[PDB]
Write a protein that binds this DNA or RNA. Structure first.
Length: 179
RNA sequence: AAGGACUAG
C-alpha cells in the first residue's frame, strides 16, 4: 500500500447538506475509501463546506480525477490532490495552475526529454526550455504547461524526479507575487 | 473551497 498523502483528495465546495455517507457513496464509485470526512464547526456541527476522501490506492485517485467534473447533492465540487499540512502556508502551496517548473536539468536537457518524461501525467500544451538571451546557453530549467491543473498537482507530490539522467526538481509555476 | 483524530507510554 502507498503513502496516505498519495491517496488523498481535498473536496471543496460541498453543499452544507452533504454528509460523510453521501460523500463516501459518491467517491466509492472509483474504489474503496479508507477515510472519508466532512469538516464541521465543533459547536454548531454546521458543515464548513469541504472534506477529504482517502482511497486505498493512488490508481483509484487517478480514476476519480479522470472522471471530473464531480457533483454531489446538486453542487459541482472541487476535488484536488491533498496538500500536506506541513506544506500548507508555504508560498503557492494551494495555487491552482496548469504550469510546472522543472529545475536541475542543466544544459543537455531538451524539450523532447521533458515531453517524453511528462506526457504520461497528462496532455501537454506547451514546453519551454529557458536559455540565456546573451550566450544562447540553456539555463537549467524549463516549464511544462498541461491542459489541466491536476497533472501539476499530482507531479509535485513528489519533489524529486530523475529526468534525463539528472536529479531534477519540480515546483508549481508561480508569478513573482505568489512567490 | 485546507485537516477531524484511540495524536499521551
Amino acid at each position: 500500500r502507498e503513502k496516505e498523502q498519495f491517496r488523498k483528495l481535498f473536496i471543496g465546495g460541498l453543499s452544507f447538506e452533504t454528509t460523510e455517507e453521501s460523500l463516501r457513496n459518491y467517491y466509492e464509485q472509483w474504489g474503496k475509501l479508507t477515510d472519508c470526512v466532512v469538516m464541521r464547526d465543533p459547536a454548531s456541527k454546521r458543515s464548513r463546506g469541504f472534506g477529504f476522501v482517502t482511497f486505498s490506492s493512488m490508481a483509484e485517485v487517478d480514476a476519480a480525477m479522470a472522471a471530473r467534473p464531480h457533483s454531489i447533492d446538486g453542487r459541482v465540487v472541487e476535488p484536488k490532490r491533498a496538500v500536506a499540512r506541513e506544506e500548507s502556508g508555504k508560498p503557492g502551496a494551494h495555487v491552482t495552475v496548469k504550469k510546472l517548473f522543472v529545475g536541475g536539468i542543466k544544459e543537455d536537457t531538451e524539450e523532447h526529454h521533458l515531453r517524453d518524461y511528462f506526457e504520461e501525467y497528462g496532455k501537454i500544451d506547451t514546453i519551454e526550455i529557458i536559455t540565456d538571451r546573451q550566450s544562447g546557453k540553456k539555463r537549467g530549467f524549463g516549464f511544462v504547461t498541461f491542459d489541466d491543473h491536476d497533472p501539476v498537482d499530482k507531479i509535485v507530490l513528489q519533489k524529486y524526479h530523475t529526468i534525463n539522467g539528472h536529479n531534477a526538481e519540480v515546483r508549481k509555476a508561480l508569478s513573482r507575487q505568489e512567490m
